[PDB]
Amino acid sequence: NDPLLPGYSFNAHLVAGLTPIEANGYLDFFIDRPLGMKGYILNLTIRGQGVVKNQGREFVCRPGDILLFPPGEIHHYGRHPEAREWYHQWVYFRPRAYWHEWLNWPSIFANTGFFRPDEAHQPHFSDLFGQIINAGQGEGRYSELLAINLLEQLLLRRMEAIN
Amino acid sequence: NDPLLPGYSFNAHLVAGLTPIEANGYLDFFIDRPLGMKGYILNLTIRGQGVVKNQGREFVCRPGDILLFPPGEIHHYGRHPEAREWYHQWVYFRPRAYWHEWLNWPSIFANTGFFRPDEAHQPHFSDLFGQIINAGQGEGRYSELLAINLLEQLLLRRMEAIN
Ligand SMILES: C[C@H]1O[C@@H](O)[C@H](O)[C@@H](O)[C@H]1O
């Protein structure tokens, strides 16, 4: 099934994609998983604006913003009501054991993290995020491993950036 | 110490660099580690030609050729006498445990691995190898991790390319 719509199982394998939300279109609905997921999600906004909701709180994500949703965290977000669209790339994954230090991002609220590269590094992170999606969507024997690897690269580039 | 000159103490840390050998220049001598090293080395020729020696045998490496020298493997190589130069990028490393299946390369002799990406892949491996060096020579606290990550990517890109 389409991972962008209900009925798709996210569990142990990495899954990546682009959710091109456009007002009034087929994807114009909120992600609403109050019990969270069985793995992590990294979300990069590439167009428009999204609104991330969590127990009454709202945070507007804009192009270049990267959000981190650890397992069990509430997933409640969708296109900002005042924006015509919210295109966001995302990657669902289970981390390698040693990735945890790099998964500690400052929370906008609850345990939903946020990282935004500075303008100089925006293109590189966006490019890298796209590579993750391309790899994650491959069917090759090493596709998932490559996606995992690229995601590790992103986490490390962030570690470099914040430092 | 300059890792480009004999006597530099290698160890568990990844070290990467460019050895721009020019005929009669300060790097115009052969690497001669007849009992090998504790770690692995990936070598990418980027300019000129090198001659890799092993118990009387010689292999001429050219731009685009990637060599793998596993621990204990003889290192005996230098600028090909017919070449004005031999610029090679290299990365000395201890692999992550799970990389084992990606480090079993076809040998030119003994257990000296060889990988020549096809024409389409060449630029990608060239760029990736350059990223490894860039990361590996980085100043940051995550430079080594980033180099290791990029190396893993190269290994996986090779697995992907040959599969
Ligand atoms: C796991 C993945 O599921 C898709 O349906 C959503 O569009 C995306 O934001 C992300 O939550």
Ligand SMILES: C[C@H]1O[C@@H](O)[C@H](O)[C@@H](O)[C@H]1O
């Ligand atoms: C580990 C590294 O050491 C340098 O001195 C060499 O120029 C290079 O080929 C590689 O062997």
